[PDB]
């Protein structure tokens, strides 16, 4: 039967290009959690597939003035991919326009950020230690 077209996006450790010296081709170019997921789904459900990176490099949001979607979401709306296998969040706005499996991972938004004897010479200034010695 027809191979399913699977849209995805580069995102470590979900989807990466494999490192190698020989050039790699086709599906053999990719690895990661989502790639292993896709392999398992394909074996359970009995399909073959072709992985394609989303051409615009976006996950997907709706334009506020013209109402059009982009990213992997738009690829699914337009039936240019059969599946999106990626760290693709299930959201209210997206579930109104595409369908999602139940989740394979749960998460939430959070924040990524950053985490001397000279503290004895500071209280009493070097200039003061000097004069107190001169006097």
């Amino acid at each position: 039967n027809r191979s399913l077209i699977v849209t995805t996006i580069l995102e470590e450790p979900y989807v990466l290009f494999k490192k190698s010296d020989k050039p790699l081709y086709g599906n053999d170019r990719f690895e990661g959690y989502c790639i292993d997921l896709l392999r398992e789904l394909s074996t359970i459900l009995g399909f073959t597939y072709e992985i394609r990176l989303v051409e615009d490099g976006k996950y997907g949001a709706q334009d506020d003035v013209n109402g059009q979607w982009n990213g992997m979401v738009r690829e699914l709306i337009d039936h240019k991919a059969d599946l999106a296998v990626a760290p693709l969040a299930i959201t209210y706005v997206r579930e109104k326009v595409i369908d999602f499996s139940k989740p394979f991972m749960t998460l939430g938004i959070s924040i990524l950020y950053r985490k001397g004897v000279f503290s004895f010479l500071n209280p009493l200034s070097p200039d003061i230690w000097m004069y107190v010695l001169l006097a």
């Binding site: 399913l4 580069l10 995102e11 470590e12 979900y14 990661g32 959690y33 292993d36 997921l37 398992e40 789904l41 359970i44 459900l45 490099g57 976006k58 996950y59 997907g60 949001a61 990213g71 979401v73 699914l76 709306i77 039936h79 059969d82 599946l83 999106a84 990626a86 760290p87 693709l88 969040a89 299930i90 959201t91 706005v93 997206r94 595409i98 369908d99 999602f100 499996s101 139940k102 989740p103 394979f104 991972m105 749960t106 998460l107 939430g108 938004i109 959070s110 924040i111 990524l112 950020y113 950053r114 985490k115 004897v117 503290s119 004895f120 500071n122 209280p123 009493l124 003061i128 107190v132």
Partner: protein
């Protein structure tokens, strides 16, 4: 004697202010109420859209900032966001799963606060696809058998990153 009395009194008093004052970002609210530390998110993803749509005052204030500063603070990939955290005074709004991966490998970085919301990652399909329910059942099977946990551990292998003054007077003594 009166001279040294004043000095030692000054030293003591001054040393106290440095210890009194000695006695800090912990949440989104802490970011929202300031602008010295910039913040942002991946353009055209779910995190951006959460802020863009939110009616919650803290998050609405954060959206107004990110929208104003979007050419600088909205980035095209998590990779770009990380590089901004490492290279400037910037906090990145990011999904927690990805933060766990990044913090296990960048030991100078951390998660601030908890989760702002709760969501899942799912396999997308066009609306009406028969694959959607079949993939749900396969995912549930993989979860129950332990395979998803094994895959997370595999791709989530980050066995790294943890999760005086008086002395100076002793040396001058000896």
């Amino acid at each position: 004697w009166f001279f040294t009395l004043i000095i030692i009194s000054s030293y003591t008093a001054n040393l106290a202010a440095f210890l009194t004052v000695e006695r800090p970002i912990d949440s989104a609210d802490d970011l929202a109420k300031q602008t010295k530390i910039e913040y942002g998110a991946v353009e055209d993803g779910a995190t951006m859209t959460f802020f863009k749509k939110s009616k919650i005052s803290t998050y609405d204030k954060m959206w107004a900032f990110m929208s104003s500063r979007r050419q600088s603070v909205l980035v095209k990939s998590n990779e770009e966001g990380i590089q901004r955290v490492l290279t400037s005074d910037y906090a990145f709004l990011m999904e927690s799963t990805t933060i766990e991966f990044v913090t296990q490998r960048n030991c100078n970085l951390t998660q601030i606060g908890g989760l702002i919301d709760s969501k899942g990652y799912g396999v997308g399909t066009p609306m009406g696809s028969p694959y959607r329910d079949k993939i749900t059942i396969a995912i549930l099977q993989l979860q129950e058998e332990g395979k998803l946990h094994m895959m997370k551990e595999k791709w989530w292998r980050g066995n790294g990153c943890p999760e005086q003054n008086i002395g100076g007077i002793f040396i001058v003594l000896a």
